[PDB]
Amino acid sequence: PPAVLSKSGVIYGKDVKDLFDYAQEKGFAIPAINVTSSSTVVAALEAARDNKAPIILQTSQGGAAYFAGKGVDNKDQAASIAGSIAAAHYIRAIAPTYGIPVVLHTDHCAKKLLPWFDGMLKADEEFFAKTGTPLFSSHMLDLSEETDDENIATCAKYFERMAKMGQWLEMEIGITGGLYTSPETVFAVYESLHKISPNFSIAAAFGNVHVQLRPEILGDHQVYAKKQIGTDAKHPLYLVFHGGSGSTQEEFNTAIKNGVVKVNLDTDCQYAYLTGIRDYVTNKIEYLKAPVGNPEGADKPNKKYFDPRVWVREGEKTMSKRIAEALDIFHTKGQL
Amino acid sequence: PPAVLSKSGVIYGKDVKDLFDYAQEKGFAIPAINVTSSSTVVAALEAARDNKAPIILQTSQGGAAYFAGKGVDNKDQAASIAGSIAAAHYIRAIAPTYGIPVVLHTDHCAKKLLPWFDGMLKADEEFFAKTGTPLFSSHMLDLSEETDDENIATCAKYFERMAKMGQWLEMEIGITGGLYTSPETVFAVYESLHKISPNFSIAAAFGNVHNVQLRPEILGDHQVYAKKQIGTDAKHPLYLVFHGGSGSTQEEFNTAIKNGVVKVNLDTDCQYAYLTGIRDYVTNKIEYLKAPVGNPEGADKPNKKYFDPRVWVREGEKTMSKRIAEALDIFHTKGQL
Ligand SMILES: [Zn+2]
Ligand SMILES: [Zn+2]
């Protein structure tokens, strides 16, 4: 029973590995929720604390720039870098208040967005020097469009620099050669990275479009790797599930059976978060400056109905419940 | 032309006093916008940067708690403390990007809420020892409902702690004793706080309820009262703050500024404006159901392009910043950098 499960706030290094090993041996996945604001991270940290669970918070290139502000010029990645750094501090500062472990991660970063990556690593190293931990728990590379040699080669390059701070790296491989991801292809990724550090996960292509989903393939990766490595471990790899929304409870089950520790959500939550605020369209009669349908026809004050603290909270509550659904479906609810 | 007019990020210490003196000398005031989310601080910073203006961002007790999340128990001021600190780091982290000097302030703290004040002040100090700087630029005490010798008493003790950090204290005095606040009472505050440090500002009851009419002229009375009993030459020995005065005329704002108001608080107006742009996303209500869009096809064509919060939340930002840009024109702070 690793320390991680009793901790509170953002975790790093060995705590991230222990948590992922705990997930594999207790058989649950941890949802990874894309966030774009303090409000949406509040929604996720709440759903997580309430169901006594660990959570992964991620920022995409676009979500990171939202934290910066859409009016901040991002031609140079200046917004995604500032925004992600801004969200990192905010999340670090508030996460302990909810009393769970939080993995802080960045989402998909393709080859043309590598400067977004480079800026985060700089800030990471700088932060690591002053404080003993990086800023982010985890970072993702998605060079699945490149050939696999380039993809694995430059992941190793970054990974070597990431490993100096114990940071976690998530890597994606698709079907680019020089259809699903072959287990051989996935083991090649393991070969190079495990030479550097064991703190890495892999997201493969198994029908999870983002003709359908063959979660049984992830077991084939795990099994192939077993043989090659010559190990007893059921789950020699750490695996991630991309494009998760719409898959049945049974699909998520074999995926988790096959070593998946993390399932990404985003646009499900996106919609969820909207519902609560959308459903406040019952009050459009009370959502003008002073005109109220109710009492005092035009002399009533609508402050109590237009306070964003009132209606944004509706979005938080509705997003949280969607997340809670997941936390149960992924068997993560109650694992602390 | 003080150095602050060319800085980016949360300013501290003398820069704050430097900003206020320029505000008094050039005769503008600075809107303080209450904020509750990253989304809302973005709206304010973007309005400041676009209208080339300094800006004050503040957090009320319930604003801080919101930043922490409404599902967090605040009964020991536990959410307002965490939430104000987490908002402080985010604002500090993002402010430089907008290329603007920012004052990071905290709104009305009464006697019942002073746990919150101690929680914020302990963390300011921990952070000072590590960085040479507190988190917040200034804080407000509002002990106007207590007797004025008790109001000024605790302010002085807290100000003595804050002055080690160059931190700015804002104090509110009302009509109680120990109708409008007199100049005599106001100069009492200045009498006590000026011992500790210059970096403070007064909010007095001059009919700005938050019956009596609003009379900005009294602010001049305070200045000329303090002026005489100091004996100095300068028009404004006091730093003065305008609370709850939205919907006052441009003339009423103009006389308050010329009496040395440097900070006008805005809260509900921005709230309504923020909602405005998101509410106007009525419009796409038919696109606001999971996957079927009444437009192109009822299954086949999807809606994620319209339900993305990065789209519609931004609309609230844009209308909130527009309300803030009017304020910077009305308070003449527009284009002062
Ligand atoms: Zn992917
Ligand atoms: Zn007041």
Short mmCIF file of C-alpha atoms and ligand atoms in Angstrom, two decimals, chain A residues 107-108 140-142 144 170 172-173 203-204 208 210 241-243 264, ligand 1:
data_model
loop_
_atom_site.label_atom_id
_atom_site.label_comp_id
_atom_site.label_asym_id
_atom_site.label_seq_id
_atom_site.Cartn_x
_atom_site.Cartn_y
_atom_site.Cartn_z
CA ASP A 107 -1.77 16.58 -23.51
CA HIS A 108 -0.87 15.86 -27.14
CA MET A 140 3.02 13.91 -23.51
CA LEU A 141 4.56 13.67 -26.96
CA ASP A 142 2.50 12.69 -29.92
CA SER A 144 2.50 9.43 -34.15
CA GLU A 170 3.58 9.62 -22.17
CA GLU A 172 1.96 7.82 -28.74
CA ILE A 173 2.47 5.61 -31.58
CA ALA A 203 -0.84 5.22 -26.06
CA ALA A 204 -1.35 2.92 -28.99
CA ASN A 208 -9.70 4.37 -30.69
CA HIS A 210 -9.32 10.58 -32.38
CA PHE A 241 -6.71 4.96 -23.61
CA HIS A 242 -7.29 7.88 -26.01
CA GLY A 243 -10.65 8.61 -27.48
CA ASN A 264 -8.69 10.59 -21.35
ZN ZN C 1 -3.81 10.53 -29.06
#
